[PDB]
Every structure is written in C-alpha cells, then in structure tokens.
Write a protein that binds this ligand. Structure first.
Ligand SMILES: O=[N+]([O-])c1ccccc1
Length: 175
C-alpha cells in the first residue's frame, strides 16, 4: 500500500459507503425493486402511486418539491436516514450485541444493511447474526448471498457483503 492507499480508509465512512451503494439522484426515480426513491437511497413509499411518493417527499423536505430536491436537501435527508438506522440498531436487543462485537468497518456494513432493509428485516437473519458475532466471516457472507435482499438487487448489496467478509474498504475502491 502506498501512502495514498493508507489514507483511503480515513476517507471512507458510513456516509461515503452508502453514497456509493445508493447513488445520488435529485429527482424521484424507481429503485431496482421498483419503489419510488430519491436522494441517497431515500425510499419514499412502496406504493406504486407517484402521487403518494410526491406527497411523502414534500412532507420529508418540508416544501413543495414537485418531485425534485437540491443536493443540500438530499444530504440532510441522508443524514436523517443514517441516524435512524444507527438508532434502530442501538435500541434493538438483538442487533445491539452483534453491532458492539463488530470492528469499525463491519459496523458501517451493519448500519448500511439496516439502512437498506430496515431493522426487522436484518434482525430476522438469525444465522447471519450468530455467524458475525462468532467472527465466522466467510459463512456470514455466503449466507447473506442467499438472501432476497442481495439476489433481487445484487449491485446495491454486493459491496456490503464483501465488507462483512473482509472488514476492509476494498470493495469501495476503484469505482
Ligand atoms: O446491527 N448488526 O449487528 C448488524 C446489522 C446488519 C447486519 C449484520 C449485523
């Protein structure tokens, strides 16, 4: 690793990680599962009614957006969503002990997974959680690769899985 390469982990954090997995879009679009989304992976609603999604958006941003937001607004919503995922882990009796056992980089992978799937979805991965707590990284990654979360939308999940396997930021290099 060059000096520059050794600096790379200090440039990566949960915000940069999710920004890569989710992308940044200033207009309402449908995600790989067909759900209306905006900003940095902000799911607006699961309903197929665009009007519902716009309504959610205006509520979330606090103004008449007509389906469009600014970069600054995307960032604020993103920071709210990250905070929500972190809070969801820490208050959960099942997720917290696993999170606490993890190193810093795998904790980011955990927050990412919760950001994507929600608390109950993640907390339902009983075997994966046990494997992570036991540092069975290869098995945990293989089991995550069986999930609908990954298989329905591999590009959004693949880097998170690799990160659980390795505890490094390598999957986020060389975009
Ligand atoms: O909160 N966690 O320990 C956690 C969350 C998501 C995936 C794996 C572990």
């Amino acid at each position: 690793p060059t000096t520059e390469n050794l600096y790379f982990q200090g440039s990566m954090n949960i915000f940069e990680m999710l920004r890569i997995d989710e992308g940044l879009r200033l207009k309402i679009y449908k995600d790989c599962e067909g759900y209306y989304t905006i900003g940095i992976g902000h799911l607006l609603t699961k309903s197929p009614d665009l009007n519902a999604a716009k309504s959610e958006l205006d509520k979330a941003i606090g103004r008449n957006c007509n389906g469009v937001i600014t970069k600054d607004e995307a960032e604020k919503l993103f920071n709210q969503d990250v905070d929500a995922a972190v809070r969801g882990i820490l208050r959960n009796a099942k997720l917290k002990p696993v999170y606490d056992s993890l190193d810093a980089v795998r904790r980011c992978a955990a927050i990412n997974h919760v950001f994507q799937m929600g608390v109950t979805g993640v907390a339902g991965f009983t075997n994966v959680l046990r494997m992570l707590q036991q540092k069975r990284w290869d098995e945990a990654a293989v089991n995550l690769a069986k999930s609908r979360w990954y298989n329905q939308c591999p590009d959004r999940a693949k880097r998170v899985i690799t990160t659980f396997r390795t505890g490094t930021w390598d999957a986020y290099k060389n975009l």
